[PDB]
Every structure is written in C-alpha cells, then in structure tokens.
RNA sequence: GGUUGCGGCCAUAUCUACCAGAAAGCACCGUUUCCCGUCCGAUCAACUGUAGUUAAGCUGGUAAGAGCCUGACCGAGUAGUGUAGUGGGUGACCAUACGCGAAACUCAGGUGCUGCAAUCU
C-alpha cells in the first residue's frame, strides 16, 4: 500500500486543460461570453479592454479577438507614464486612471475620434458614460476585461476603466465598484472619487506618516523625498499629467539600443541546446559501459 | 396474434414516386428568418426600388 | 441437466454475469492451473496445446471433466511435478433455459449454466513440459478430447513454455542476459525505459 | 413500454469525445456563418441548448438565417418518399463549416486563372476535372532491380 | 543554497471538537476568542454518526486560524505545556505538526470554573515564502521539490529554536 | 533569441525526477491609513517599488523515462467485411472469385508550434 496514482493508465487517459488555463492565465468560461459577438453582426469585431496589474506595473490593451489569435488595437503601459510626469506610484488607482485615460486617447487618435468624444475634461468624479452625439459617429465601445483578477468594490481595475471612460471611450459600466460608494445606501460620494483620481488617498497617507512614524516615511516614499515632492503637490502632478496625455499621447517607442539580431545573439549564449539522436545514444552507451565493470 | 411492423416493400414503394427533391427556388421564403433583419430588408428593398427609378431619367 | 447438444453452437450474444443478469450458478471449473504451476520457465520448454477447430461453446461442466482427465492421466503416468496444464478458457458466458404453464408467452430463460465460447484455432488446454514427457502429456490431452464436443486437435508448439518466444528465439535471448525469470513467467529486458530501473533488474545483462 | 424520447439512442452520439471534454475552443464561436454558407452538424453534448435533434448529426445543410447565438439551417430530410425541407435553429457550437464547399470555391478561382492565362496565351484550355485514367505504357528497368522469384509458402503451424 | 527558504510559521490552528451543540460549544468558542483574540468559526458535520452522537449540519467543533506574530506567541505558550517535548510522530510527513493538550487552564489564563474546561488541538503549518505561489488566483502552481517543507527539516528547525526535543 | 499582455490550435504543450537562467520582465517579496474582504491583510483589497531574493514560481536543458503525437512493403493484406456461385462441409463453419480493409503488436523519429502588441545585453 500507499495509493499509487500516476500509472501510464492515468496519463494516457488524462486531459490537459487548455494551456492558458494550465498556466493559470485566463477564464475561458468568461472568454466564451465576452468575445462571441452576434453572428447577425458577422465580421464586426468586439473590442475588449484588457487591464492587468502585474506586481509593480499596469498593462492596458484594447484587444479584438480573431480565430487567428487576438489582435491589439492600442496599448498603454504604466511604465510609459514618466514621460507625462508620473515617476512615483505606477500601480496606484491614479496610475490606472492614467493608463486607462491614456488608452482612450491612444485609440481615439488612431480611430479619428479626437475632437468629437473628448471625454470628461473637467473631472468632478461624476458618474458619466460617454453619451453619443446626434447625427454623428458613435463612441468606440469597449467592454472591460477584468479577467482572473477580482472585482471588489474600489479596486484599481476600475480606475483604468474610469480613465478610459472619462478619456473618451464608451465602456459600459456601473457605479458601485468605484470607491466612495455607500454599501448601505445606493449612492456615490463624488468628492471621494476625485481624491482617488488625483492620488488624494495617497497624499493622506503621506500626511499621517509625516507627524507620526518617520521610520516608514523614509522607507516608503523614497521617490518623493528624493525628488522633494511633498503631500499636497501630488494633485498637480496627476492634474498636469492628464492634460499632458490629452495633448500628445500618440505613442513614441523606445530608442531600442542594439538590434533584434544583436539581442538574439546575446540571449543565444545562455539558452542551452538539445541533442541529436546519436548524441543521446552516446550518453546511453557511456552510461551502459559505466556499469559493465561495476565501477 | 397479427404481425406488428415492417418496412418490407417500403422503399420499393417510395421509388415508384421517384423520391422527388425539394425542387428549390431562387427567392426562398423569408418567413421564419429573424424579424429584425426582415424589417430592415423591407426598407432596403424600398430604397433600391426608388433608386432604379432615379437611374431611369 | 440439459444435454450439451442444445447449447453447443455459439448462437446468442455473449451474455455474462453482470448488473443485469446478476443471478447465476457457479462454474464447475473454478480452478485452472495444474501440476507444477510454480515451475520455472526453463524447466518446461515443450508446450502441447489443445486447439479448437470449431466455433462451439464449451460447457464449464465439460471443461472441468476434460481438465480432470488430463490431470488424472498425466499424474498417473509421469507424476504431479511433471508438467503444467493451464486451461486457457473461462466460462463467462451464461446459458439460459426456458424452464416450465404459460406456453411461450414470456419465454425468456432463467440462467442454467456457464459456457466458454471458443473460436476456431483458439487454444483451450495447454500443457507445458520437458520434451522427454511429450507423449504422456499428449496422450492425456487425447483423452480430454473425448470430454469435449465437436472437433479440436492437439498441437505441439514451437514456442517455449507459454512464452511467446519461439524455441530458438528463447534460447538466444536466455543464454544472453535479456531474460530474467520471474515467478510464473519470463520478463524481458527491453531497449526502452529508465536505464537505472533497467540496470537494477537484469544484472546478468550489460556484462 | 417502448420509448422514443428526443435524445433516444444517443448514448455514443453526444458522448462528448475522448480527451476533449469541458470547455469549447474559442475559434468555434468566432467563425462567421453568413447566409448561404454550407454547414455540417456535429452535436456537442456540453452545449445543451440549441442542440440539434439526433437525426441531423452528420447531415449537412444551408444557412437560411443567422441570429444572436445561432444559425438556421435548412436540411432536406427524406421522409417516406419526398424530401421535406426542414429549418433548424442551431447554436453555432453544434455546427462546423463545410470543407466540401471550401475545396470547390478554390477550384473555381483556379479555373478563373487557367482560362485567363490560356486565352491570353493561345486559347487551348481543357479545364474540367477528369477521373483517374487507365495507366499509359512504360518501360520498367531490371537494371539494379532483378525480379525476385516468389513462391507461395508451406503451411507451418502459426 | 539557502537564503530565501527561511521556513517560518504560516498558520497556527486551535481546534476544539465537542460532540453535541449548545452551551459547551459556545463556551469552547469563547475560550478561543479570549485565547487567540480573533472571533473563531463554528464548523459543522458532514454526516450523522450516532455512536459519537452528532447529527449532520449541527455545528459544534470550533476552530480558529492564527498567523504571524500572535501564532508564534501562542505556539510558545503551548509547547510549554508539552514541556518542549514532542514525538517523532506529532510531525506530518508534510513538514507540519501539532500536539494536543488537555485543559485550556494551562498557558496563563485562569481555571474559570463557570466557563468550563476544554482541551485544544494545536496544529501548526510550516510554509516557506513563496507559498502564495499555490494559493494565488492568477497563475497557480505547485511548489518545487527543494522547497517542500519536510518532516526531517522542520524537526531540525524545531530542535534549533524553542530548545525542544524529539524524544523517540 | 529572452520576457511580458492578450491570444489561436489545445499534451509534440501532460506528468515524474534532476540540473541551468546574464539582461530586462516576471515573480516571490515589505506595509494596513484609506476603498475592500476574511475566523485569520494567508486569499482578496489597497500602498510602496522602497528593505530583500532567484529559493520557489516561470523558462530552458537532461532521462535506453511514463504519457502524447507522427510514420513505416512492423505486424496484416491478417481480422473483419460488400457482392458471386447448383463452391466445400452432416453441420458448425470454411475455401475461393471481384472488392474495401482495421486494431493491438514491432521498429523508427519527434516532445510545442505559432499570431498580434510591447519590451530587453
């Protein structure tokens, strides 16, 4: 006895769950729903807003889905945000709202919907879906992929939503999972939403740690005391960024440094190679001969 | 007592007719087709009729 | 007990004991291996088969009494440790019977007894042995023919024991190191599988 | 009592597959069935709604209608002595595009070019298909290939 | 080599199974709520046993999960009761362990004759960092062989700190 | 080439055991004021990218590996079978004629490929 359950039998019979599923990557149960468009619409694509918070980054893509393999329309990474001002905190709520807001403005420039559909310029943190203009083109419609991330009332994913929404996209959404929503009353405290858009929730935690515990205030926020950026200037940083995005978000790529071919040649040093059928037989033959005289 | 079922002769019988195909037609019955589509396909046809009158001028 | 001529041919679908049939008597032949069944492969080179030439069912009842003759004859002549009869046929198939007032209204049968369906050329009995013994085996199997119906015909194999290897192939493989004797039956060293697993066993090979 | 319920005798017909249970690969739902498209029908246990009746498994129709999750498919089923057109309403997941029409459409596109190339060059065409002909005559070499004298073998045991 | 395989206490659990459902239960609940500080959770049965004397979905056995600093302190209170002397058993092959005591009167507190006396199944789970790996939603995975908390290594970890013994 | 995001086919991608991983990225990883969720900030939430580390994940490589696939005048043109006989055979079944034609088995080879977007000595 022990149990014994990985016989040839088991493996032979066992079904591999897709791969994305196997790399705990995505919910195909929800992909089914999210991607499949009305067949009576035919080839029209269903754009879906991928939002992914990695450990220490945000990735936001607007994606179409094909048989071929889902194609990207536009991509806004948070690590592209220091060109607009934001050095510090690129996984915030605010950072999301930046990446989100920027997405809209990436896409809308590459769809010719710049002037019409400016999005929410003023930003009171008021709940407003981008209403269509009469006798004109409609707004680009994207459905949010949270994905295998959780949606919990007031998570960053909805930042990047509200950005994109308020950046000019129509993204069908509701209020509640924005912060400052009363759990015990169907309402929004629009003041509490402004704060999260402008890192106000961060500038409060700045302010508390200034008086109380200067141990962690020097540990955390090393970026802020190095640049000499104190609590109450955070609003203006995000504020100026938003406008900076609205101006010129058309995506510059990196300077590269070294060609693709140089890169490959450098990585190809480290990757180990396989072996010919003869080279394995050589190892086996060597292993066999190691045990004929015993040692 | 009496015998219950069969399909003996039953194909032979069917091929005295011929087994005549559906026949098929250009313009099949749009009856049954999605009513949303249908509605607009009427206006479509209303549109194209008017245009062929305009081309004859 | 119905005469075997009734059920002799392989007519109905294989109808075994299952979660539909459930009810059935036991077999008669509840024991298959005879003589020196513990013997080593090298001891009994010479297989003599008893092979069908007929697509007949065999009642368990016969199979026991066929087995008991080749038992009782070979043991008489050359002794118990002389040979190894293996019956290679298992009464799985169940025979029904329409026992009887109703006439033939509702005439599906209750289970009568088991039978072992047997195709043409299918082995039934097989007696491994020393080549010296041969005739005293055969001549037992020739008696066990009389218990069975129809036709069958005893055949001295060109295979080692029950081992699927031929007489020559086995001797080539054994006097090398590719063969190791297990309990019942010979296991073969492959040229396949994890080598560590393959080295521990078969130390006679590789040297 | 006898029984002929909607999924009668399907035991194996809807039995999902082997090592292909569970979620359906997403290309299925992508494929665009325009009206007129020709489609075969494999049921897909999993997808219980809009499942085709066990008849049409295998059968191969035309799309007469498309909608939200589904196509209509007219399959002309024989019945007695006269094929009644039958309009299904199947979800995509029970359909596959008909490869038979795909091959044909290609062969038209080739038959465009074989005619266009030929009439430009010098008319002569021949551009139907033709059934594999009787093999024409040839020389076959014995050089490096001397013919083996076979014989039927004697009957050994096994 | 050994830097991040640091081997600390992931959670300490205090189960108090009882065979009924009422006062005895709620007292034993309060006990843990005063011991661990956290509001404990009342588990329910799977099926009616009769012999032991429980009906299904009756709820009585109370447990609490504790992690981090407080677990480390409670552990040290418990092992005082065993005398820093466990067994070769009382140690999962999975590198986890426990030790059951009788009477919660031990490890400080009081007798408290009104509330009653109750044993407490201590069980502790040793997990190295990168145990989130498994429990995280996006991109689950099994932990590697080298990082599996073993019986042999946990015992040595337990011999090292808490000046404890293996006995058998 | 490496990595990330979303992917397509869904093991040539699974699994088991052992090694290697520069850069970036990934990750583990630190913190509980806020939105948030738990019996428990483990999970989830948020904050920092700061204190740390490639240990684990992840990737790659090794194995006369399990599995998986692919192929073969490997088994087998067998088994089966559509049609033919006033062919055989007491029959059971079988042999032929024109046809189609398996599976185990045996050996050989392989062990993810690939799309879009971005990024990296």
Description of the molecule:
Chain B: GO terms for molecular function: structural constituent of ribosome. This is part of a larger assembly, with chains A (295 residues), B (57 residues), C (207 residues), D (158 residues) and E (168 residues). Chain A has 295 residues and is an alpha+beta fold. Chain A contains 11 helices and 4 strands. Chain A has helices at 8-13, 28-35, 93-109, 156-166, 190-197, 200-211, 214-219, 222-227, 234-247, 260-267, 277-289; strands spanning 48-54, 57-64, 71-77, 143-145. In chain A, strand 1 (48-54) and strand 2 form a beta hairpin. Chain A starts with 7 loop residues before the first helix and ends in a 6-residue tail after the last helix. In chain A, 27% of the residues are buried. Chain B is mainly alpha-helical and 57 residues long. Chain B is elongated. In chain B, 0% of the residues are buried. In chain D, strand 3 and strand 4 (84-91) form a beta hairpin. Chain E is built from 4 helices and 5 strands. Chain E has helices spanning 23-35, 68-82, 132-135, 151-160; strands spanning 8-16, 41-42, 62-66, 97-101, 120-127. Chain E is globular. The chains are: A alpha+beta (295), B mainly alpha (57), C alpha+beta (207), D alpha+beta (158), E alpha+beta (168). The interface between A and D is medium-sized, with 20 and 22 residues. Chain A binds one RNA strand of 121 nucleotides through helix 1, strand 1, strand 2, strand 3 and helix 5.
In short:
With 57 residues, chain B is mainly alpha-helical. Chain B contains 2 helices and no strands.
List keywords for this structure.
part of a larger assembly, 5 chains, C: 207 residues, alpha+beta, five-stranded antiparallel β-sheet, three-stranded antiparallel β-sheet, 4 helices, 26% strand, elongated, E: 168 residues, 17% strand, RNA-binding, Ribosomal_uL5 (chain E), Ribosomal_uL5_C (chain E), Ribosomal_uL5_N (chain E), KLLA0F08261p (chain E)
| String of helices and strands of chain E | EHEEHEEHH
Q: Specify the number of helices of chain E.
A: 4
Determine Rg of chain D (CA atoms, Å): 26 Å
Encode the helix/strand succession of chain D as letters. Answer: HEEEEEH
Portion in strands of chain E: 15-25%
For the largest sheet of chain D, list the strands in their spatial order: 4-3-2-1-5
Radius of gyration based on Cα positions of chain E: 18 Å
Oligomer: part of a larger assembly
Tell me about the biggest sheet of chain E? 5 strands, antiparallel
Structural class of chain E: alpha+beta
Shape of chain D: extended
Q: Identify the most extensive interface between protein chains.
A: A-D, 20 and 22 residues
Strand order of the largest sheet of chain E: 2-3-1-5-4
Helix percentage of chain D = 10-25%
Instruction: State the distance separating the first and last CA atoms of chain D.
Output: 51 Å
- Beta-strand percentage range of chain D: 15-25%
């Amino acid at each position: 006895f022990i149990k014994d359950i990985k016989t040839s039998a088991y493996h032979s019979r066992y079904q591999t769950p897709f791969r994305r599923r196997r790399e705990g990557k995505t919910d195909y149960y929800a992909r089914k729903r999210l991607v499949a468009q009305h067949k009576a619409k035919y080839n029209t694509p269903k754009y879906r807003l991928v939002v992914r918070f990695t450990n220490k980054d945000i990735i936001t893509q607007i994606v179409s889905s094909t048989i071929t393999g889902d194609i990207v329309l536009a991509a806004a990474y948070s690590h592209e945000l220091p060109r607009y001002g934001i050095t510090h905190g690129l996984t915030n709520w605010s950072a999301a709202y930046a990446t989100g807001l920027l997405l809209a403005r990436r896409t809308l420039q590459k769809l010719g919907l710049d002037e019409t559909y400016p999005g929410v310029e003023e930003v009171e943190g008021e709940y407003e879906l981008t209403e269509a203009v009469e006798d004109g083109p409609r707004p680009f419609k994207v459905y949010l992929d949270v994905g295998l991330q959780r949606t919990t009332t007031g998570a960053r994913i909805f930042g990047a939503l509200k950005g994109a929404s308020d950046g000019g996209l129509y993204v069908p959404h509701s209020e509640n999972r924005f912060p400052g929503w009363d759990f015990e009353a169907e309402e929004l405290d629009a003041d509490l939403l402004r704060t999260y858009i402008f890192g106000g929730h961060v500038s409060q935690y700045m302010e508390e740690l200034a008086d109380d515990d200067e141990e962690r205030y020097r540990e955390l926020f090393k970026g802020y005391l190095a640049d000499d950026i104190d609590a109450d200037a955070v609003e203006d940083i995000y504020a100026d960024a938003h406008a900076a995005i609205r101006e010129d978000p058309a995506f510059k790529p990196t300077e590269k440094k070294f060609t693709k071919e140089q890169y490959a040649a450098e990585s190809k040093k480290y990757r180990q190679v396989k072996l010919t059928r003869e080279e394995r037989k050589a190892r086996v033959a060597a292993k066999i001969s190691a045990l004929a005289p015993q040692e | 007592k009496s015998k219950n079922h069969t399909a003996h002769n039953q194909t032979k019988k069917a091929h005295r007719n011929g087994i005549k195909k559906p026949k098929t037609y250009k313009y099949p019955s749009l009856k049954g087709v999605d009513a949303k589509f249908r509605r607009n396909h009427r206006f479509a046809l209303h549109g194209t009729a008017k245009a062929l009158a305009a081309k004859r001028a | 007990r119905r005469p075997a001529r009734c059920y002799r041919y392989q007519k109905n679908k294989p109808y075994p004991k299952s979660r539909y049939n459930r009810a059935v008597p036991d077999s008669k032949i509840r024991i298959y291996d005879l003589g020196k069944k513990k013997a080593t492969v090298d001891e009994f080179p010479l297989c003599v088969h008893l092979v069908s030439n007929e697509l007949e069912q065999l009642s368990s009842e016969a199979l026991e009494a066929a087995r008991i003759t080749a038992n009782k004859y070979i043991t008489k002549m050359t002794g118990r440790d002389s040979f190894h009869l293996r019956v290679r046929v298992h009464p799985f198939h169940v025979l029904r019977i329409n026992k009887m007032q109703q006439g033939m209204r509702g005439a599906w049968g209750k289970p009568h007894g088991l039978a072992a369906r047997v195709a043409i050329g299918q082995v039934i009995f097989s007696v491994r042995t020393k080549d010296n013994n041969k005739d005293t085996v055969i001549e037992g199997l020739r008696r066990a023919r009389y218990k069975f119906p129809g036709q069958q015909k005893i055949i001295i194999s060109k295979k080692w024991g029950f081992t699927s290897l031929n007489r020559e192939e086995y001797v080539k493989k054994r006097d090398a190191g590719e063969i190791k004797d297990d309990g019942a039956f010979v296991k073969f060293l492959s040229k396949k599988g994890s080598l560590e697993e393959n080295i521990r066993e078969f130390p006679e090979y590789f040297a | 009592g006898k029984s002929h319920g909607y999924r009668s005798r399907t035991r194996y017909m809807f039995q999902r597959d082997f090592r292909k249970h569970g979620a359906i690969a997403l290309s299925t739902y992508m494929k665009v069935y325009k009206v007129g498209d020709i489609v075969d029908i494999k049921a897909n246990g999993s997808i219980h709604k809009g499942m085709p009746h066990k008849f049409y498994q295998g059968k191969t129709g035309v799309v007469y209608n498309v909608t939200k999750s589904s196509v209509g498919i007219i399959i002309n089923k024989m019945v007695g002595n006269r094929y009644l057109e039958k309009r299904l309403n199947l979800r995509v997941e029970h359909i596959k595009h008909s490869k038979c029409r795909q091959e044909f459409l290609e062969r038209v596109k080739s038959n465009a070019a074989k005619k266009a190339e030929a009439k430009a060059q010098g008319v002569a065409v021949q551009l139907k298909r033709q059934p594999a002909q009787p093999k024409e005559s040839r020389v076959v070499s014995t050089e490096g290939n001397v013919p083996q004298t076979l014989a039927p073998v004697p009957y050994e045991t096994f | 080599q050994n830097p991040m395989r640091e081997l600390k206490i992931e959670k300490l659990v205090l189960n108090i199974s009882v065979g009924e459902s009422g006062d005895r239960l709620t007292r034993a609940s309060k006990v843990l709520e005063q011991l661990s500080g956290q509001t404990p959770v009342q588990s329910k049965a799977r099926y009616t046993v009769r012999t032991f004397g429980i009906r299904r979905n009756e709820k009585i056995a109370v447990h609490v999960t504790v992690r981090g600093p407080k677990a480390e302190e409670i552990l040290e209170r418990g092992l005082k009761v065993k005398e820093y002397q466990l067994r070769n058993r009382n140690f999962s092959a999975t590198g986890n362990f426990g030790f059951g005591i009788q009477e919660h009167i031990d490890l400080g507190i009081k007798y408290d004759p009104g509330i009653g006396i109750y044993g407490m199944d201590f069980y502790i789970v040793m997990g190295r960092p990168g145990a989130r790996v498994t429990r995280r939603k996006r991109c689950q995975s099994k932990i590697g062989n080298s990082h599996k908390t073993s019986k042999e290594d946990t015992i040595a970890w337990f011999k090292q700190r808490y000046d404890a013994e293996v006995l058998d």
